[PDB]
Fold:
Amino acid sequence: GTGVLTESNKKFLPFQQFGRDIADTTDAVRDPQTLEILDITPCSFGGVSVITPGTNTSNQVAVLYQGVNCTEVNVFQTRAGCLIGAEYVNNSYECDIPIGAGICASYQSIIAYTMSLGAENSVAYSNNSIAIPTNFTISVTTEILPVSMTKTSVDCTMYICGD
Amino acid sequence: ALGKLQDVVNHNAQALNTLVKQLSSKFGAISSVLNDILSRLDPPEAEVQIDRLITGRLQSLQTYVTQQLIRAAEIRASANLAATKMSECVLGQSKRVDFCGKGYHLMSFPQSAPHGVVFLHVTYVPAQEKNFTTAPAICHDGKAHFPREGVFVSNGTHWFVTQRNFYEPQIITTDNTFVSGNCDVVIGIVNNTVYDPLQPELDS
Amino acid sequence: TMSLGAENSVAYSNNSIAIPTNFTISVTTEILPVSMTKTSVDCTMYICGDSTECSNLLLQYGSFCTQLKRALTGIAVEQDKNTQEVFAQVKQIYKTPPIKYFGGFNFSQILPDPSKPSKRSPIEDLLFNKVTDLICAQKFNGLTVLPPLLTDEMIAQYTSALLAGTITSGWTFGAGPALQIPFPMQMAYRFNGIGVTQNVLYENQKLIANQFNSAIGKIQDSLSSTPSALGKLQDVVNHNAQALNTLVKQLSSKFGAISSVLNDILSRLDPPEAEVQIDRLITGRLQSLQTYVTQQLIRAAEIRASANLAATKMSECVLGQSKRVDFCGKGYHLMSFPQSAPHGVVFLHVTYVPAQEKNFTTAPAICHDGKAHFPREGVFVSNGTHWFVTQRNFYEPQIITTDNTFVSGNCDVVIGIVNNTVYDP
Ligand SMILES: *[C@@H]1O[C@H](CO)[C@@H](O[C@@H]2O[C@H](CO)[C@@H](O)[C@H](O)[C@H]2NC(C)=O)[C@H](O)[C@H]1NC(C)=O
Ligand SMILES: *[C@@H]1O[C@H](CO)[C@@H](O[C@@H]2O[C@H](CO)[C@@H](O)[C@H](O)[C@H]2NC(C)=O)[C@H](O)[C@H]1NC(C)=O
Ligand SMILES: *[C@@H]1O[C@H](CO)[C@@H](O[C@@H]2O[C@H](CO)[C@@H](O)[C@H](O)[C@H]2NC(C)=O)[C@H](O)[C@H]1NC(C)=O
Ligand SMILES: *[C@@H]1O[C@H](CO)[C@@H](O[C@@H]2O[C@H](CO)[C@@H](O)[C@H](O)[C@H]2NC(C)=O)[C@H](O)[C@H]1NC(C)=O
Ligand SMILES: *[C@@H]1O[C@H](CO)[C@@H](O[C@@H]2O[C@H](CO)[C@@H](O)[C@H](O)[C@H]2NC(C)=O)[C@H](O)[C@H]1NC(C)=O
Ligand SMILES: *[C@@H]1O[C@H](CO)[C@@H](O[C@@H]2O[C@H](CO)[C@@H](O)[C@H](O)[C@H]2NC(C)=O)[C@H](O)[C@H]1NC(C)=O
Ligand SMILES: *[C@@H]1O[C@H](CO)[C@@H](O[C@@H]2O[C@H](CO)[C@@H](O)[C@H](O)[C@H]2NC(C)=O)[C@H](O)[C@H]1NC(C)=O
Ligand SMILES: *[C@@H]1O[C@H](CO)[C@@H](O[C@@H]2O[C@H](CO)[C@@H](O)[C@H](O)[C@H]2NC(C)=O)[C@H](O)[C@H]1NC(C)=O
Ligand SMILES: *[C@@H]1O[C@H](CO)[C@@H](O[C@@H]2O[C@H](CO)[C@@H](O)[C@H](O)[C@H]2NC(C)=O)[C@H](O)[C@H]1NC(C)=O
Ligand SMILES: *[C@@H]1O[C@H](CO)[C@@H](O)[C@H](O)[C@H]1NC(C)=O
Ligand SMILES: *[C@@H]1O[C@H](CO)[C@@H](O)[C@H](O)[C@H]1NC(C)=O
Ligand SMILES: *[C@@H]1O[C@H](CO)[C@@H](O)[C@H](O)[C@H]1NC(C)=O
Structure:
């Protein structure tokens, strides 16, 4: 195989040599030279994602290594993974590019932030006061709904075999 | 704005392109061209190579049909939703909240779009709200008066009854209030006069 | 042979009506799944791992890997879209007043708890507790679980904003600006929505508040005491992990080859037959991955339908009062409260249930002075000797006058008209 061999707290019985997971994947082994138990843990892997604005706007990019701690690879650690190339800002804005776990990225340089849910409003509730509208706005809004698709027919014999 | 409909178009062409791209896959065979396989091998091994191409292409076609069926189900659900919006928002006024736009729905207009429909929802949005002091009931002559259709409001010194969704203060009379019980049960009842229309009539 | 139900015969007659004389404030739970676990699969790592020869043979099959990655990416973005649609329906984060007095109504079990670090309600905390090296094994085979875009605390914050809007402002915040209204007046408006007069709510305010508080406490006890209350959400979690486990288990399948380990196949056979064995492993693993993606897509469609339903319930039951029968609970719907749950939403539907009905003799119209009188808003009832007009959904007899009746025609046309006096103010 291929993996890190860390120290193990698992007490093997004397007849056992390997160890397996719930899903029947090896998670432990006994060294045949010295009778010690090691926790086989596979080496780190991650989904490299590239966070970029439009090429019309800028050519700066940020890289998210999904699931990878920052010590195993403008470097910030998120629950989604390690984000390199974006600077964490304590301000909260609306989500522009979603990163995950409440983190979003935007271009202003590329910044990473905890997204704001909404503007804070406190309703002036009291037991004897009401708010009555004195005017109105006629609002027209758009709702776009798909209805049909492209009707496709495939000649199975011609597609697979041709002439 | 029109990202959803274009997305459907984008998926369909891409699916056909992927299926077209699958014709250029060897699938574990010597060549991806059937004519070359026939022109190059004897039928005992050409049958094996054609079998590999057939199973790969058949798997690709079945995969394409499966995603087409899933997308057909999604588009059918969207079309059923669009028909429901056309029936309830365009052909009538809907009391369902947020079904036919944000706000109190007034009416809707259908517009055709490529592979889709665009609904223009005309809604009523309240604005310019004002604070008032409110009471559940008015105590007059030992009787509790409740609004027939409105709400009791006070601007600081005087009490009026107005409709809930627009500020239109009117004098509290017996015409727009109804009497149920005395003043001892309702929590928050306030003391105010209730005008009688017949009183000037018999007085004069 | 199973019994369909208890047998009830309704005492139908041509001149008798049953009028409720009391009510029950019923709170019922509706549990809806909203999102699934977002999964991403490295196609090359899953099928071949570290073997270069396996990847070279895998390249002959084309854009299958791209199709599977694209489908999983679509499902992953779809789950976040589902969560946004269900919970992110307000652009203002509303807050409750510091004095939690709402005219006797107690919302402690549904409002956020300041004491808890998670800022969740007691019901939400119970829901999170009741919904539960598997993760490590799933991770080690090239399958990655992606975190939800909205964290549980932000989803709880959205539910808190919706609760604050529905409590302090009623349905106004859902249709525009949040307009403050006292909660008894809001409940009176809701009573008018289901056809019950405001006086019934105001006179019986303490009883209604006590019934609501008792129902909310019963809801918390019922959720804490029943294992199968939260079966739907756990089922979704149960399916997702099982699917990953099955996919992981498929790596231990020979698929008609000598071994399931690529390194053994390379170390033991010559390339002409090793290529065949690797091909068998590749086709089996690719079939397993396509099967997993196909079921993920079908489950994604089901969860999307459930999320659309949850968004519709949030719009129509929480942000307004619904006249649709059984959409927002059993009974005449008054209001609804959203609670966040793992991968889902729980709606507490507060409904009005009529109770303690009483028989009365009824007539379509009252004949007075050769004229037929019909009720403006109620129904004519008789207790045996005297005739009254009452509202349909609560028994409140009132004297039949010209104010609450309207005259249409004479007494010769209406079938079942009875003779009674009509008072004139
Ligand atoms: C209600 O709002 C409308 C706007 O929606 C107000 O109409 C405006 O009136 C001002 C001053 O008379 C004009 O300068 C604007 O051009 C008007 N706007 C429009 C769109 O007509 C109206 O005055 C408001 N009414 C109240 C009672 O507040
Ligand atoms: C109704 O009255 C309340 C309180 O008198 C107003 O709430 C205040 O709003 C201002 C500006 O938005 C804030 O600076 C105060 O802190 C608020 N006070 C409280 C106690 O909430 C409310 O704005 C009034 N409504 C209208 C329509 O004017
Ligand atoms: C509350 O509303 C009433 C009715 O509009 C106001 O009473 C009027 O006030 C104007 C302004 O001074 C006088 O010219 C009228 O003669 C008043 N009418 C009556 C019948 O008294 C009242 O002033 C308002 N109060 C506040 C605090 O705004
Ligand atoms: C509303 O009106 C009633 C009746 O006029 C008031 O009740 C009276 O209150 C005074 C002093 O509290 C007593 O001396 C009388 O005996 C009461 N009369 C009755 C018939 O109860 C009541 O106080 C008024 N409420 C307010 C807030 O002014
Ligand atoms: C209304 O009256 C009818 C008949 O007077 C009642 O129906 C009877 O109910 C009892 C007990 O439920 C049965 O044993 C009888 O057989 C029923 N009679 C008929 C003719 O169905 C009915 O219960 C009364 N409703 C109320 C609310 O008291
Ligand atoms: C309507 O039903 C309620 C119960 O839901 C009744 O309230 C009960 O009243 C009795 C006697 O007055 C008390 O002993 C109970 O403690 C009350 N229960 C609750 C929950 O408050 C009420 O009396 C009924 N009303 C009518 C007119 O029958
Ligand atoms: C609202 O309900 C909460 C919880 O149901 C009440 O809190 C309880 O208060 C009683 C007596 O004060 C205690 O014995 C319980 O232990 C409390 N339970 C919890 C969970 O706090 C609360 O008193 C009610 N009323 C108000 C005004 O908040
Ligand atoms: C039907 O209801 C009416 C009104 O509640 C009853 O009439 C009253 O009955 C009481 C008790 O006998 C008398 O003290 C009142 O004087 C009656 N009022 C009037 C205006 O007559 C009537 O008795 C009820 N009938 C039945 C059969 O229950
Ligand atoms: C309701 O009242 C009307 C009017 O008093 C009754 O009609 C009368 O019936 C008698 C006997 O059948 C006739 O002699 C009169 O000529 C009728 N008058 C009119 C104006 O039609 C009617 O019978 C009463 N119905 C009931 C059920 O008591
Ligand atoms: C294994 O090799 C070491 C080498 O020093 C030897 O001391 C030991 O006796 C061997 N056997 C076991 C069972 O460890
Ligand atoms: C409303 O609450 C205030 C204090 O917050 C109190 O003085 C007043 O009596 C209350 N009114 C009602 C109707 O409960
Ligand atoms: C109601 O039915 C009873 C018997 O079934 C009959 O005597 C009476 O005339 C009927 N009344 C009406 C208004 O149909």
About this structure: The pocket of ligand 1 is lined by residues A 134-135; B 128 (CB under 6 Å). The longest strand of chain C covers residues 344-363. Residues 388 and 399 of chain C are 5 Å apart (CA to CA).
